[PDB]
Amino acid sequence: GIVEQCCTSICSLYQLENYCN
Amino acid sequence: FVNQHLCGSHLVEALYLVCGERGFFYTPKT
16 A cells, blocks of 8 residues: 555655545 | 655655645555
């Protein structure tokens, strides 16, 4: 989930946007 | 701001800025 993708690895805009409504 | 390790409040704040009026969901347990 977001922690694995953006906190323990380097985040990206592509992945952040997966969590916008 | 996006292309780094973002944790906790720092991650929430990035979601806020990127998602704007869409809003977002923050689910750290998944």
